[PDB]
């Protein structure tokens, strides 16, 4: 039976891990002790034990202790083994240099032994959900070294990659593009699918729609957990058309180098606004295609779509799914590549999305998750290359990376590796 | 099924829409929450739980005139996204409302119109309300017609407009905006309903006997006019008349789409119940020069068309008796190329009454839409006013600093002169 | 005698067959437990065709449920007629094909076939004289369109003379639920032309047009999808499972409907589909069926028969009727439509009559027809399939399975040959 293992990395992965593992627990009914008061839909994420205790299939590995010690002192401390909360004495402190070659290597072994035993617990393994960021040194360098050792360990197993993209305007760091540029080699050759997303777009949507004018880091992670739960909803519960990971992993990636689709979830609305708004399927598919609802700050008009993945959920009927897709295709403003007039993968499930108390989204019977692979994300990496270049000319902050122990040459080669990726997307935009 | 979308613009727009949606909800039985405890598809759309949302987008540039509605009794009736406000207003400046402030919210309102088009299946009409005095309600309205024409080239867009009163005026810089709005109302509209407040003041004083009327009294009459127009769409009748039908039988030439409305009976409760009321008398009252809500005399001009809309307990026999009686009158004149200049609609349901209002509960009523040449004199007077303002180049620097080239004022004056000359050509008879 | 084995591959095949077995159980009066509560001896008359005997007056379906994913069989086992199936008829792997045709056909499905050939040989040797094999699947799946194509390849070598049909689901361009669907279909039809006596090309789109327009259903679920197929394959064998006024079986149609070995593709039909309102205004007369028989809105495929010529037409009628009007409306339709029908074959159409009506009805008909319109199905795929192939799009999932680049050109070549010969017979002189 299907199973998935969580390799949340960084403070972002830990914080999202607190949010997401809260979301599946209420989805399935697991108590904060870890016992169901009342078939095996939890088998994808939870594992039974001798005492009837259900154990999440996750590792919360960080290299600074205080972020994980909060989980150790939280309400759901009793829901893990005191092993996979793997901590470190001294962190990378926003350095890809420290997290790849010096401090990461002291707990390479223990992290790789842990993922071995969870893989040993499971019988049929589908894929790995790995959460990190492109900014933080632990989230970028350490997440890179674990991955390239995961490729040798499991050649076929799906390695989907949730990562946090630094925002075009706002930033919590100054040396983050140095970490971001070097991490692209990990996400290009050592990944199957990428879900690059910035915090800035999530700031916009909650304020405009959800009336969350002040978004704390918990509100963003709640939206992250719902997107992840929508992906695995076909695995956990039955549907008229269940779609496993390999089913949609195949149907997004035309070329091995192009595995960077864009996530979109709908509807995201408060109870004060949904009361006067009738909700059906035809308009919420239009909600996935607004430029203001894109999780990545980009314009769909600039690019064109090569592949789109629909993940409907809840009280949905396939007829109006076909009716909705009729309306979308009959539009000039929608642009599709010349070599894919049929670019759609529909996912249908029965159980509606669940709502956590103290959240933001209202209880809505139907929802849709959009996974669109377009070439409009091409400009997204163009701005970093400009941002990287105006630091690369002045040789700023290089003594930190050189002092930790890399030759300066790989900084240049990675830049060309991004640059080659840009032209590959440019070939996609060319229509014969 | 039939659908009409209201796009209220400006302070006049929001107040008139308040009136209109009020009497609409009491017409059909919608609660202030928006449920029927016990035909509505044209102006309300259904939800799952039995809620019904109005198909209106209130939009302005000054937030107070809509946040009064937000704190009003119908706050939960309206979807809050239908209420669109700007931070700063044009302050009665056409250039401000068309080229500096409007373009910020143009995308939002057009996306909203996209959403309503998605909600609707068979769309019949866009009803837009604004004024010719306010800067927002002139320039913003002009650009929204200009864009909405290319978004829906075929769809009908009726244009209810407040025309600046011949004598009284709430502003001094209003003739410039009124001059510049004419190009849009000429080349981006199918039918327009100009009306001034002065004549409605006169009607309310002479007939309905309020010595000190307010804006609500006038807006109730305008809402009654809109209700009489759309009653054929809302409910059945012996002759249902659609917007396409009465827009066909009103417009002889593309440049001439400015009918004048009329409503009857308009009288108090005691005199209403105490006088015998009949189709002949209400039809004769429709043609009285004192009951016109535009300050012009059709006896000075010639009718080219008459769109007639009875309502209530009316009979085709006395309908035709009245039409013969009206035709047998030398005072009423008709153009030579229209021996038959009438189109009559019949509706069963009598008009309803709104509390705090002015009309009595009357078993029959009538609306008239006369297309005559008598309206051009008002444009002549506003041309005289605009010329005597423009000779001294007063208040031009405001629009120039807003960023507009000066010659379009003279261009719009030329357009109005050409429209007047076309009206004169229609007035010329080939005898 | 004349026995039948129902293969079940892919999620599409599994739910369709689950409803399919439910239908015939009501037709034969078999309860969910497995016993018989009917009354007519005709119910237990030819019951061995579909089912097998068990102790305690119990009868068990002859089906092989195959799926690479173990989740679908939980839904099937939890269905209404869920316990009537055999637990080791459920032969399932642990990982799916991921809608990747090469994975099911080569990599993982080749691990599950050997267990499948065990059971399909088991049901084959129990019956003394098996009629043929029945398989339902979708061309847009990974197991049904993938390993299922391998399944028909081997079984043909083992059992050459027995018939086999496939109620395969053909993908549609206006509503496509899979982007690599033309890739899976192009590699699946090449398997179908070589080893298949007859195919019933079902398009899911036209059925949505069927229920929305003719039936007036607001929310047609996938159960209503499976009905209209489940009523269809029941109608093909209703002459086999019951005595008829003019008898037929699967072979009688098969020899009559395939003029040349390349052409075995058919669009099905069912006459009495009427909404709730339409029964108020209806006369249960057999001329009324013939319009519902011959209207293009009735078709279950995505090809208007107006644009091609009818090659061979077949009509089986389920119910008690005078068959003077079987061959009268027959002749009226052909004479009036002499232009559309092919000319080198006069009297193009077939008849068959079963005396026993459908359960809950008096009179039903099932249409099977071979026309030139079916060539519009495949060239639409080729316009779209050639699009990805020219840029080698979505190729690494296929090339990564250890397989070459030649078979994409060969499948297209075999495809492009078939339509050309099909078009050649469209433009033929008598």
């Amino acid at each position: 039976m299907r199973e998935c293992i969580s390799i949340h990395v960084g403070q972002a992965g830990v914080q999202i891990g607190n949010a997401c593992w809260e979301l599946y627990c209420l989805e399935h009914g697991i108590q904060p002790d870890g016992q169901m008061p009342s078939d095996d839909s939890f088998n994808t994420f939870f594992s039974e034990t001798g005492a009837g205790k259900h154990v999440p299939r996750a590792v919360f590995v960080d290299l600074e202790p205080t972020v994980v010690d909060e989980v150790r002192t939280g309400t759901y401390r009793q829901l893990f083994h005191p092993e996979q909360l793997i901590t470190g004495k001294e962190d990378a402190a926003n350095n890809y240099a420290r997290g790849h070659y010096t401090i990461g290597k002291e707990i390479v072994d223990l992290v790789l032994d842990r993922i071995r035993k969870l893989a040993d617990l499971c019988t049929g393994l589908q894929g790995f959900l790995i959460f990190h960021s492109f900014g933080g040194g632990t989230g970028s360098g350490f997440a890179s070294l674990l991955m390239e050792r995961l490729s040798v360990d499991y050649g076929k197993k799906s390695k989907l990659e949730f990562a946090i993209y630094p925002a075009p305007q706002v930033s919590t760091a100054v040396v983050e593009p140095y970490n971001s540029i070097l991490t692209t080699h990990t996400t290009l050759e050592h990944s199957d699918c990428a879900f690059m997303v910035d915090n800035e777009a999530i700031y916009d949507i909650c304020r405009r729609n959800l009336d969350i004018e002040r978004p704390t880091y918990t509100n963003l992670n709640r939206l992250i957990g719902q997107i992840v739960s929508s992906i695995t909803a076909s695995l956990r519960f039955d549907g008229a058309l269940n779609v496993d990971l390999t089913e949609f992993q195949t149907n997004l990636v035309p070329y091995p180098r192009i595995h960077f689709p864009l996530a979109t979830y709908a509807p995201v609305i408060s109870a004060e606004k949904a009361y006067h708004e009738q909700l059906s399927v035809a308009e919420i598919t239009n909600a996935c295609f607004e430029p203001a609802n894109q999780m990545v700050k980009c314009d769909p008009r600039h690019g064109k779509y090569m592949a789109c993945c629909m993940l409907y959920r809840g009280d949905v009927v396939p007829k109006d799914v076909n009716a909705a897709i009729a309306t979308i295709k009959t539009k000039r403003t929608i642009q599709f590549v010349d070599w894919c007039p049929t670019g759609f993968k529909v996912g249908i499930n029965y159980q509606p999305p669940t709502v956590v108390p103290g959240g933001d989204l209202a209880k809505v019977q139907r929802a849709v998750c959009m996974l669109s692979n377009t070439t409009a994300i091409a400009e997204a990496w163009a701005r970093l290359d400009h941002k990287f270049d105006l630091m690369y000319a002045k040789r700023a902050f290089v003594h930190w990376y050189v002092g930790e122990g890399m030759e300066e040459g790989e900084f240049s080669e990675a830049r060309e590796d991004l640059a080659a990726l840009e032209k590959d997307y440019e070939e996609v935009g060319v229509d014969s | 099924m039939r659908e009409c979308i209201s796009i209220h613009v400006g302070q006049a727009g929001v107040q008139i829409g308040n009136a209109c949606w009020e009497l609409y909800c009491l017409e059909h039985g919608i609660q202030p929450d928006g449920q029927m405890p016990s035909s509505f598809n044209t102006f309300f759309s259904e939800t799952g739980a039995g809620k019904h949302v109005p198909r209106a987008v209130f939009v302005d540039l000054e937030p107070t005139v809509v946040d009064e509605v937000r704190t009003g009794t119908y706050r939960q009736l309206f979807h809050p996204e239908q209420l669109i406000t700007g931070k700063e207003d044009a302050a009665n400046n056409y250039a401000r409302g068309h080229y500096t402030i409007g373009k910020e919210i143009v995308d939002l309102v057009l996306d909203r119109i996209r959403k309503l088009a998605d909600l609707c299946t068979g769309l019949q009409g866009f009803l837009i309300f604004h004024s010719f005095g306010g800067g927002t309600g002139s320039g913003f309205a002009s650009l929204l017609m200009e864009r909405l024409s290319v978004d829906y080239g075929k769809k009908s867009k009726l244009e209810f407009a407040i025309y600046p009163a011949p004598q009284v005026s709430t502003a001094v810089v209003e003739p410039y905006n009124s001059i510049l709005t004419t190009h849009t109302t000429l080349e981006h509209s199918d039918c327009a309903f100009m009306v001034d407040n002065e004549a409605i003041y006169d009607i309310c004083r002479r007939n309905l006997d309020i010595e000190r009327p307010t804006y609500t009294n006038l807006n109730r009459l305008i809402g009654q006019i809109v209700s009489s127009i759309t009653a054929s769409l809302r409910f059945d009748g012996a002759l249902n008349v659609d917007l396409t039908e009465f827009q066909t039988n009103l417009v002889p030439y593309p440049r001439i789409h400015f009918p004048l409305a009329t409503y009857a009976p308009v009288i108090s409760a005691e005199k209403a119940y105490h006088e015998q009321l009949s189709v002949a008398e209400i039809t004769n009252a429709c043609f009285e020069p004192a009951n016109q809500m535009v300050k012009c005399d059709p006896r000075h001009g010639k009718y080219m068309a008459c769109c007639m809309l009875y309502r209530g307990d009316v009979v085709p026999k006395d309908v035709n008796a009245a039409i013969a009686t009206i035709k047998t009158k030398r005072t009423i004149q008709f153009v030579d190329w229209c021996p038959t200049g009438f189109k009559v609609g019949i509706n069963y349901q009598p008009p309803t009454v709104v509390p705090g209002g002015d009309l009595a509960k009357v078993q029959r009523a009538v609306c008239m839409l006369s297309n005559t040449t008598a309206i051009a004199e008002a444009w002549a007077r506003l041309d005289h006013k605009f010329d005597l303002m423009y000779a001294k180049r007063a208040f031009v620097h405001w629009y120039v600093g807003e960023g507009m080239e000066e010659g379009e004022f003279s261009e719009a004056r030329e357009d109005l002169a050409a429209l007047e000359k076309d009206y004169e050509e229609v007035g010329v008879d080939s005898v | 005698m004349r026995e039948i084995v129902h293969l079940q591959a892919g999620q599409c095949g599994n739910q369709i067959g689950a409803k399919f077995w439910e239908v015939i159980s009501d037709e034969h009066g078999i309860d969910p437990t497995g016993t018989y509560h009917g009354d007519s001896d005709l119910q237990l008359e030819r019951i061995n065709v579909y089912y097998n005997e068990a102790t305690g007056g119990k009868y068990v379906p002859r089906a092989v449920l195959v799926d690479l994913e173990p989740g679908t069989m939980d839904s099937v086992r939890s269905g209404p007629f869920g316990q009537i199936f055999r637990p080791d008829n459920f032969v399932f792997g642990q990982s799916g094909a991921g809608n990747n045709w090469a994975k099911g056909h080569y990599t993982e499905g080749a691990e599950l076939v050997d267990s499948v050939l065990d059971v399909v040989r088991k049901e084959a040797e129990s019956c003394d004289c098996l009629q043929g094999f029945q398989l339902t699947h979708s061309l847009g799946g990974g197991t049904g369109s993938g390993m299922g194509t391998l399944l028909i390849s081997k079984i043909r070598e083992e059992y050459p003379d027995r018939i086999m049909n496939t109620f395969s689901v053909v993908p549609s361009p206006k509503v496509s639920d899979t982007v690599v669907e033309p890739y899976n279909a192009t590699l699946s039809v090449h398997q179908l032309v070589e080893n298949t006596d007859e195919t019933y090309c079902i398009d899911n789109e036209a059925l949505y047009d069927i229920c929305f327009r003719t039936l007036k259903l607001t929310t047609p679920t996938y159960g209503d999808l499976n009905h209209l197929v489940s009523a269809t394959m029941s109608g093909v064998t209703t002459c086999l499972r019951f005595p008829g006024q003019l008898n037929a079986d699967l072979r009688k149609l098969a020899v009559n409907m395939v003029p040349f070995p390349r052409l075995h593709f058919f669009m099905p039909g069912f006459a009495p589909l009427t909404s709730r309102g339409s029964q108020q205004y209806r006369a249960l007369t057999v001329p009324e069926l013939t319009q519902q028989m011959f209207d293009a809105k009735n078709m279950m495929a995505a090809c208007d028969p107006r644009h091609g010529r009818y090659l061979t037409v077949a009509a089986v009628f389920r119910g008690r009727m005078s068959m003077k009007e079987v061959d009268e409306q027959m002749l009226n339709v052909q004479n009036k439509n002499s232009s559309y029908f092919v000319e080198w074959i006069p009297n193009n159409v077939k008849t068959a009559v079963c005396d026993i009506p459908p359960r809950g009805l008096k009179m039903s008909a099932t249409f099977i027809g071979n026309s030139t319109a079916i060539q519009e199905l495949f060239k639409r795929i080729s316009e779209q399939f050639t699009a990805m192939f020219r840029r080698k799009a979505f190729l690494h999932w296929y090339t990564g399975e250890g397989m070459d680049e030649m078979e994409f050109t060969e499948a297209e070549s075999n495809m492009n040959d078939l339509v050309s010969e099909y078009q050649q017979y469209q433009d033929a002189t008598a």
Binding site: - | D107, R114, A117 | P305, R306
Partner: peptide, 23 residues
Amino acid sequence: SFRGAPMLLAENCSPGPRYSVNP
């Protein structure tokens, strides 16, 4: 006769959901 009515459609049109909102 042969009853060929694949043509029975109503009318429905609307522009595209591409227009920017300015965050």
